Design a protein around this ligand. Sequence first.
Ligand SMILES: *Cc1cc2c(cc1C)nc1c(=O)[nH]c(=O)nc-1n2C[C@H](O)[C@H](O)[C@H](O)COP(=O)(O)OP(=O)(O)OC[C@H]1O[C@@H](n2cnc3c(N)ncnc32)[C@H](O)[C@@H]1O
Ligand code: HEC
Ligand SMILES: [Cu+2]
Lengths: 75, 393, 124, 124
Amino acid sequence: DLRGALLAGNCYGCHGPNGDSQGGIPSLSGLDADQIAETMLAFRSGTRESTVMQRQASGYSEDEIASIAQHIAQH
Amino acid sequence: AQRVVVIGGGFGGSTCARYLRHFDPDLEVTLINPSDTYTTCPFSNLVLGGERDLASITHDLSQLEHHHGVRLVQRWVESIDADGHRVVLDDGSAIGYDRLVVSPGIDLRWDAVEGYDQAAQEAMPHAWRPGEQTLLLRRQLEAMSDGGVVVIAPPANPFRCPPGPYERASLIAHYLKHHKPRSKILILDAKDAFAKQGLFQTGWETLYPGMIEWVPGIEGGTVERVDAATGEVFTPSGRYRGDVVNLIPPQHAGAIARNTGLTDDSGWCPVNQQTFESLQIPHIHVIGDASIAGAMPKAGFAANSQAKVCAAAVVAALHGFDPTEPSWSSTCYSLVGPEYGISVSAVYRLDNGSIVASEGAGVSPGEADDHFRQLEAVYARGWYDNITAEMYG
Amino acid sequence: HAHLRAADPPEAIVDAAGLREIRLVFSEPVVDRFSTFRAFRLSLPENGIRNLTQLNTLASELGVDTEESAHHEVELESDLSQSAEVTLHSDEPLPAGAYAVVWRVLSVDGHTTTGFHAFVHAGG
Amino acid sequence: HAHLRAADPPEAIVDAAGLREIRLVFSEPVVDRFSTFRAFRLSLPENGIRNLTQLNTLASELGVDTEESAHHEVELESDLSAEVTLHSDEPLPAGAYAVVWRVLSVDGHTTTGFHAFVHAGGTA
Ligand SMILES: *Cc1cc2c(cc1C)nc1c(=O)[nH]c(=O)nc-1n2C[C@H](O)[C@H](O)[C@H](O)COP(=O)(O)OP(=O)(O)OC[C@H]1O[C@@H](n2cnc3c(N)ncnc32)[C@H](O)[C@@H]1O
Ligand code: HEC
Ligand SMILES: [Cu+2]
């Protein structure tokens, strides 16, 4: 669906086209749903320290985080 | 075969063209832009600070045709036939559309600051549109003798990239600190507050102490008049002279949006907050700086973000389905110095027909260490190479 | 053409405690009846000027014609029929400042020119 | 050690009407008791000065250890934590000025320097 595509599309803005980073910001492509979701939430609550990932991660609900997670790994 | 014509190959349009083919590869997608190449205003501050050149921030649009099958037309769009669903070019040719995406960026308001018309831009460059102007200002900074004063006059909201003038100050300072250490920067602001003000000022105090003076509008910082002949800026606190002066005039939507009647009184384009279809001419969509997008800054990231939602929405409209619920994000990274980075960042969400920031949005933390600034600098360059890859790879 | 060849105060920053006399020397003589001289204390930019080119630029917005301006006029008395040597008086001495002397002059060759001379009077 | 990063008034010619203080900003803080500031109103030559290099020449003649000189010293009460504001009770008259210092940082290093400017008068 387009819903998931829009939730996810913005991640490519920093993380590179379909998760392939040119550098600096880590890559996304070589990660599965579970890893993505589990660290989104980790950044969100603070558990995992971010420079900007909490600012971004906090912008999403737990449901949306699952959609984003799925869609990036599937694609 | 259904047709989408996209006007402009910058942050908005190129992202739109690519995503249109991603969302429906059955579309005949034509993107129109005066040039085979695009130079980014982002990172042009590093050109001003003599860290890169214009080539290093210029990109080929050819990949959109070669790889993603977007017909790339190198022309100016002169006229929009809204009724006849056609676009007229500068060569006299025409190109028809079932749905039109307009992402033309900004024009400078020539009638806004007394003294500053089209002719004033050679001596008193804005450089708010990159290329020729970036080049002119840098050559000025290079020719300025040590001990001179650079004047930067940013405008009132709203304008393209609200931190941009303050990163410009920062990086010009970086160039001055290592080549012209006596030189001074003077910001004559129309506003009483700016983006990431706390962060910039702490950055300036530590990287460029004593280099930079900031005068708010409330203390007579506003530019009422300028004299392009004499490097003079006139303000309620008096007359100032700059050895180099960067005047940044208030802005509005690109000519094509204005001329076509897509803009309202404010000089920006009102649009359906969900679909970015124009609230004024049906079947034309407006993205990027030219749009009125609620909370969303006039930033490159925003344009790119808006482009995605827009692509999705036009395929929705072209295949007779309801538009989906949309999501956006924007993040403006500023390099206070090449190894000192700060950010303002947000995710966006429709809330009562208005685009609004989610909770969580904010600027870099106030009381952080040097490592943190270094990292955000690394990440800024990451974003830059990444987002341009997405548009032009 | 009657051009400025020399002047006192000269084109510089000078201590001139009681300045009451400004002297102009022109390349040809000059017709009193058809020559005008005016003089202004320049109100400098807030962040000031850094050299004499900037004195001159600023001084050149004035001219014998000018009306209301940023600057402040100092009433003068010409002391001359025909002469290459013009001398300008004020009863009281001049406050310190950047000054511009602007003229329109008829040469004896029949030509009209305009011009200016600028200096900085530092006090003393 | 302790270099000057900014000064008010700037190293320029200015209309500083009744200037009652001079403000200096250094790269790091500066020890009060051990640091001395002196200010001199410059006596400019007959011919005057044509630019800032020549003003900076004229100031480098002076120093903190300076007894007999061409120029007139001025009484300043000093207030020092990297900004120094030199104060005078009386507003300063028009002049080319020099401020000169010997300055001790907290690492025990000394740095001397000068900052010159031209105050060209004007009114309140
Ligand atoms: C000036 C500036 C901007 C800036 C920045 C720093 C500076 C100094 N830093 C940024 C940053 O760190 N992060 C960020 O997200 N944005 C930053 N920006 C802003 C960014 O430049 C703009 O917000 C962005 O450009 C907006 O995108 P948009 O697509 O709306 O405008 P554009 O990129 O300029 O592209 C417009 C293109 O279309 C062509 N054009 C215009 N009219 C026509 C017609 N009639 N026909 C054909 N082509 C047209 C233009 O030539 C241009 O290529
Ligand atoms: C969806 C919209 C997004 C997903 C899913 C992810 N991001 Fe990012 N991201 C960014 C930076 C600079 C970092 C490094 C961490 C930091 O300093 O904050 C990250 C990190 C991640 C990670 C951890 C990766 C790892 O290998 O350890 C994941 C799973 C991740 N991000 C997913 C930058 C940005 C950014 C900048 C403007 C945006 C919009 C996003 N990230 C968005 C998403
Ligand atoms: Cu003649």
